[PDB]
Design a protein around this ligand. Structure first.
Ligand SMILES: NC(=O)[C@H]1CCC(=O)N(Cc2cccc3c2OCO3)C1
Ligand SMILES: [Zn+2]
Length: 140
C-alpha cells in the first residue's frame, strides 16, 4: 500500500483505489496501473520534474529503503496477476531490487521529489509506475 499527496490530489495504484477514490475520480489509466482522486486537505509531497535514473524506494516487505538505478518509462509486458490479465503496462520503469505484491504503493524518489510508485515485481526486479509526466498534478 501507499499513495502520493500533492496539492489537492491523491495518487494511488489503480488496483488499490477505494470506493471514495472512484467517487472522487480525477483521472485513471488501466494501462499505467494509476488512479488520481481529489482531496479536501492539502498534501505535502513534491513531484519530480526531471529525467533522473537513480533514486531510493521504500520496500515494505523488507522495512528498508534501497538506493536503485532504474530504466526510463517504457511499455513493458507484465505477467497475469490477481488484478489484471497478462498485458503491456505503459510508463513503467524497472530496477534490480526486491518487490512483492503488497509492496505496491511504495514511493521511488530522487533529489527532485517523487518519481513514481511500486507497481510490478518478480524475478529480482521491481517496477515503478512513473508520475513525472503528469504535469497537471502541480496546478489547479
Ligand atoms: N501493475 C500490475 O500489473 C500489478 C497488479 C497487482 C499485482 O499483484 N502485480 C504483481 C506484482 C506486483 C508487485 C510485486 C510482485 C508482483 O508479482 C510478484 O512480485 C502486478
Ligand atoms: Zn530527479
Amino acid at each position: 500500500s501507499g499513495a502520493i499527496y500533492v496539492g489537492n490530489y491523491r495518487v494511488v495504484n489503480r488496483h488499490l483505489a477505494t470506493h471514495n477514490d472512484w467517487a472522487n475520480l480525477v483521472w485513471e489509466d488501466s494501462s499505467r496501473d494509476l488512479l488520481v482522486s481529489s482531496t479536501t486537505a492539502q498534501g505535502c509531497d513534491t513531484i519530480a520534474r526531471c529525467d533522473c535514473q537513480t533514486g531510493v524506494y521504500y520496500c515494505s516487505s523488507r522495512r528498508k529503503h534501497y538506493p536503485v538505478s532504474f530504466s526510463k518509462p517504457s511499455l513493458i509486458f507484465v505477467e497475469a496477476s490477481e488484478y489484471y490479465p497478462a498485458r503491456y503496462q505503459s510508463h513503467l520503469m524497472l530496477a534490480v531490487g526486491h518487490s512483492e505484491p503488497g509492496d505496491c504503493g511504495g514511493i521511488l524518489r530522487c533529489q527532485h521529489g517523487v518519481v513514481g510508485i511500486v507497481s510490478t515485481g518478480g524475478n529480482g526486479l521491481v517496477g515503478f509506475a512513473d508520475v513525472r509526466d503528469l504535469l497537471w498534478l502541480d496546478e489547479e
